[PDB]
Symmetry: C3
Subunit: 494 residues, 3 copies
């Protein structure tokens, strides 16, 4: 008659990591890292994104003739842009505060083009100007959303234009100034010398003087156009005045939707899916709390860590019994492969029956503790750092370096935190299982007191031939020492 | 004869958290977080702050007629500014490098107004300009610290003015340029076209051309005024030259005190109390090492963590035991003991007792005190937040600042919570291990002359008195003396 | 008739820190912090640095007469500069985007000077202008790399100049504009009022108008010179045009090597060494993974932490057996201290038979403990290689907010990593000491379980057998193949007595 104490064993092959030891096989393990994507760009919560193709943001907003499919655009969830777009400013020039405009657009979802200064209103100027830089079917053309004002006949009168915003939302207005390359061009276009362009709102006051200089030919042109933008508030008016060199707007952009969006730098095309998280390399469909695909992300999906494997050890160490009679063994030499009922067991051999009964109170406590540990580990890492895309100009290298260093540092800190937490928790889990088995064995030894012959394999042979009910009493904790101690003493005295 | 090993219990209802367990009752605990404030603004170390009221920094430094109570200002600890002040620039315009000026002012404690260009020196111009934008009792007026220069008759001679910084410290100077709305206003105000304003020092060199354009009316005016500033070093000179459109200064602001200060964005008011540090919501009065009121504080007071609870366990589990034959540590704690933590219940032929141990308890107390001190000390070099202001065209910089501060606060909060949880686990395991070690020590000393009852203590196989049990407690138990006695009774 | 279980103690004196106790003596420990330097500025991989001396970057690039030894410079590994150099802009003025130029130079290793606008192409102007602000031997002079254009007679024709970049690499070009102090100076120098300076490239378009004003005298002059720069791409053209106030370049700087370098603020002089990384205070020669000298380093060498000590406990606890029973006295075990006669391993099996004694060492436990501790040290060192490295940056007088942001970011990351390292060391020390204690207890418990009841424990660390044993039985107990069913009768018979 003997009750033996041991633990569970199975045929799992999962391997976890520990600070003191690597390459450790366990019974059950939980994976927290997702490393798979479908590699396709597609729709976020039913709203397709805005595909710019070979066009840039400036080329879309100004109305490049090549970007003629973006004249009217529906609601979008994010914007696809290429690293080096081909169709930008067809006429060579610059764009003031381009990165600030992109940052503002990174949180706008829909637009609404409003005709604020119709082309027919300029009855004292010529509005059919064009250039060969932006040519359609050989003939010269121009930006579709802007008007090029030139002299009519031989005089260029003072040009005035105003607009009072009553559209119900904030508005985006873009204008420009032309810089010719010689006085002959200036006289043949505007007939005046010493011109100015003045723009004035309630908070904006600018005066621009054109600069005439010789420059290298870009797109076959020596001149340049400089573009500026502003945000017009509700019930606020904008005023234009110029004696020449004014590229007046015709359309204003009204902010309609607003929301959470972004500009994603990719070179792919939109496919047919339905996803919830989108990365530049692909989409993610998972319920795991971590991922290692790309730091930049639009939507809702797990956090980012630079790790290759994050596995949490939930079960016990997998060391079997190493492959005739009386081999009931114990937890000293290994686990039991034939329990499959619980975690810590009470294998027994009574004079009439034998079995592999499993404990219930200790297993429940261990499971509750492990589940609490897993939940705490997950809940400690939902306040991580999220990266937001930003763009910088050629003369903003210090700021770009600062941003990159900040992002990299925070990412490294959080990765280190996650790895250290997983390793330490694995160590404590294995120690916890060993301690629980030892505590069970010690409690049974204390209860059995003297009427037991401890064998050293992990279990003890009784000094009395006590039946089942005695043994369920031992397992339950209600073993009565003086009930049957006289017979045990008599048997031991032999 | 029985000697039982156990642990102390009481009636406390303090709960701590752990990685494996939640809401565990402990005998003793320490709170590390303050969550209360008086909801008031008052003096920092006896120096009252500077209450702007319905005014802004630009309106105070330029001399807005509504801010006439700030013409002379004493020493201050911090500046109270509303989010959207009403009295700023009376005449519409703009201020160049405003945020840099605020950043500079955040480390200045006292000013001193010095008359650097008296109004009467401009004997070839008119210095009685005004506007209805800032009018007092109907009649037009102007900024009190600046001079508007206008025709004298029908001519505007070239205006020249210089100042040499012999005051004693650095000085702040402000000047302005006027942009009219039409040529008629320019001709009736200055009688010149194509004017300029030139300012030059040993470092700065500027020349501004006025702009004339049609603009929407703000405060009833279509014109604008553009203001600039510079810091004049000691024994340096500043020169003014203009043929028109010049708003010249009359006073300069000398940096007198310097120190550590800040600007608070609050809508409250100053009342009569005293504090050691101040937050925008109220004052803090504590000796605790953490708080969760507001990240931006001025003074000397604890670190900020975005947490609702931070409790450290400095005691044992509260599991009280529930006739005769007093049990031990297997069944639970003892309420009788009041002296120490680890128990050595005393029972004998003539008297019993509830004696404590003075060796293990001292070691445990020293270890726990060292742990608490290490936890508090390892966190005295954590991040602190400093206020900053950004313009409408610096949203990327503002986002970078906000993200950096938020990330550092999150990192430190995570560190705090993880440390507290791990230390609580370690403390509970430490106390259990200490009790087990005491029991094992007693069992090792008592080889065979005792029998294990199994519930936490032994019954001796031999008769003894207080001497034997005191020897057991002191680790001087000797086997050979009472050996034959026990071997006889073992039969 | 006695085997005993114990551990190892020696003559060491190293001390470690623990989260529960301070200044604990351990047998072996490993240091991870380097706190020494030679206090010298030396070569980096055989390439000497660029010694500016009393000159600034602007003075070197523009060609100050005092910096005449830097006209031709070889390859460099880093740049040594002073906090407040004396010889900068000889003629007073400014330098637009100075800090951006310094940031660009922080990744350039060699320069090669190309003559792009020879001084003799200006056949309609005067190219011998000079000033007394920077004069050699009393006679007036000017920047050696730039040309000051003035009148030839009583006229100033329009000046034009172009260059096509066929040098094979990106190029740095610097020009300037002169602001006089009165109209008399302007007429004496140019005979033109309303002049302009226009510079135009593929992506650059600028136009400057000189400003005339009265300013205080700096180095005896009331005028200022404003300098601008640009980077010229390959196969691109730069155009110049001015009616006056043009300070044209003669040489252009061609980027040749490129690499990882920086600008170091020091007041020292170069000496003869060969180091692998350099700090502003000195050079470092170490194999440790940490140092606490200076946050700004150039080269390859360990990470930086604000700590005074970082010692890892790789050994046991030094608690020697203070009591020493002279001659007579049984040898105790592990409860009352460690042993000194042990010289082989950490956990031992001292035995005392009738034909001799011994101090043997268990090899199964010692090797496992060594493997575990080595893995622990390797993991600790590995986890801290993804630290934060600081980079020097310069800011102007109107960028205080950005400077504060940079300083706070660097400092905060520094404190975070220092805290991480210190906490890891403390916790690992605690776990190591408890690990050794648990290993000794496990050895004792294992032998007790194997040996069952054929002995009597004395509680001092070991037990005396109830039967006669020899070297074979000692070896069987130590190895783990003790045979109970062959001694039970004799053991019981002896114990009954
Ligand atoms: C721009 O349009 C708004 C709306 O029509 C104008 O605001 C109105 O101004 C008149 C003044 O004659 C008031 O009587 C109305 O009550 C105003 N309406 C609202 C809704 O406030 C505004 O004046 C126009 N801007 C300009 C420069 O004329
Ligand atoms: C501003 O004032 C200071 C001191 O009043 C002037 O410095 C003095 O200059 C004279 C030149 O004639 C010297 O003789 C003195 O020794 C200087 N004194 C000191 C204390 O340095 C300074 O020159 C004045 N600024 C200007 C532009 O003249
Ligand atoms: C600068 O020099 C390059 C190379 O010498 C010029 O590029 C050549 O342009 C001509 C056009 O007339 C082509 O026929 C050649 O094939 C080009 N050569 C190369 C190597 O690309 C370039 O045109 C010059 N810049 C200017 C403004 O003329
Ligand atoms: C297990 O073997 C070695 C242990 O040192 C380890 O390097 C290796 O990576 C492990 N095996 C796998 C498949 O990772
Ligand atoms: C995401 O994966 C789940 C698997 O649980 C699947 O049922 C679901 O259809 C997937 N979603 C998409 C959009 O493919
Ligand atoms: C204590 O915390 C547990 C979470 O495990 C919660 O279920 C319980 O309600 C809490 N007790 C009280 C009194 O709030
Ligand atoms: C701060 O609290 C203490 C209580 O410890 C009290 O004595 C003191 O008066 C308080 N300070 C003020 C300003 O009320
Ligand atoms: C301790 O003993 C060792 C013996 O190997 C010796 O080398 C060392 O110098 C001694 N230390 C002191 C401080 O005497
Ligand atoms: C070692 O640390 C303890 C801290 O408990 C301190 O009291 C002692 O002075 C220290 N010893 C030395 C030599 O620094
Ligand atoms: C660096 O130190 C080692 C000793 O650890 C020495 O052998 C080597 O010569 C030193 N290097 C130099 C450059 O002095």
């Amino acid at each position: 008659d003997q009750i033996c104490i041991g633990y569970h064993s199975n045929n799992s092959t999962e391997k976890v990591d520990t600070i003191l030891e690597r390459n450790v096989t366990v019974t059950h393990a939980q994976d927290l890292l997702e490393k798979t994507h479908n590699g396709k760009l597609c729709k976020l919560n039913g709203i397709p994104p805005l595909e710019l193709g070979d066009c840039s943001i400036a080329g879309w907003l100004l109305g490049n003739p090549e970007c003629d499919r973006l004249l009217t655009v529906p609601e979008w969830s994010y914007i696809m842009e290429k690293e080096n777009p081909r169709n930008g400013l067809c006429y060579p020039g610059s764009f003031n505060d381009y990165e600030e405009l992109k940052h503002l657009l990174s949180s706008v979802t829909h637009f609404e083009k409003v005709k604020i200064l119709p082309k027919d209103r300029w009855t004292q100027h010529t509005t059919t100007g064009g250039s060969r830089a932006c040519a359609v079917s050989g003939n010269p053309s121009f930006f579709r959303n802007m008007v090029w004002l030139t002299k009519k006949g031989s005089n260029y009168p003072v040009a005035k234009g105003s607009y009072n915003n009553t559209s119900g939302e904030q508005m985006l207005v873009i204008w420009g100034v032309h810089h010719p390359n010689d006085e002959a061009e200036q006289r043949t276009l505007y007939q005046n010398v010493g011109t100015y362009v003045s723009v004035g709102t309630s908070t904006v006051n600018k005066r621009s003087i054109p600069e005439i200089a010789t420059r290298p030919k870009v797109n076959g042109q020596g001149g340049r156009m400089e573009f500026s933008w502003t945000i017009l508030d509700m019930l606020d008016t904008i005023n234009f005045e110029s004696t020449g060199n004014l590229i007046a707007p015709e359309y204003g952009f009204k902010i309609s939707k607003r929301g959470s969006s972004g500009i994603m730098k990719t070179e792919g095309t939109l496919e047919n899916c339905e996803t919830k998280c989108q990365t530049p390399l692909g989409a993610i469909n998972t319920t795991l709390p971590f991922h290692n695909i790309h730091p930049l992300t639009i939507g809702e999906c797990p956090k980012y860590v630079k790790s290759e494997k994050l596995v949490l050890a939930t079960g016990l160490r997998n060391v079997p019994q190493i492959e005739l009679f009386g081999a009931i063994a114990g937890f000293i030499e290994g686990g039991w492969q034939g329990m499959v009922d619980g975690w810590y067991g009470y294998h027994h051999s009574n004079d009439q029956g034998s079995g592999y009964a499993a404990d219930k109170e200790s297993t429940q406590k261990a499971i509750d503790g492990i589940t609490n540990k897993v939940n705490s580990v997950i809940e400690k890492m939902n306040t991580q750092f999220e990266a937001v895309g930003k763009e910088f100009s050629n003369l903003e290298k210090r700021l770009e370096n600062l941003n990159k260093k900040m992002e990299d540092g925070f990412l490294d800190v959080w990765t280190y935190n996650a790895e250290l937490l997983v390793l330490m928790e694995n160590e404590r889990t294995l120690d916890f299982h060993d301690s629980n088995v030892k505590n069970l064995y010690d409690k049974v030894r204390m209860q059995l007191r003297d009427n037991a012959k401890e064998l050293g394999n992990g279990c003890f042979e009784f000094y009395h031939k006590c039946d089942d009910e005695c043994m369920n009493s031992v397992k339950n904790g209600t073993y009565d020492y003086p009930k049957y101690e006289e017979e045990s003493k008599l048997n031991r005295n032999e």
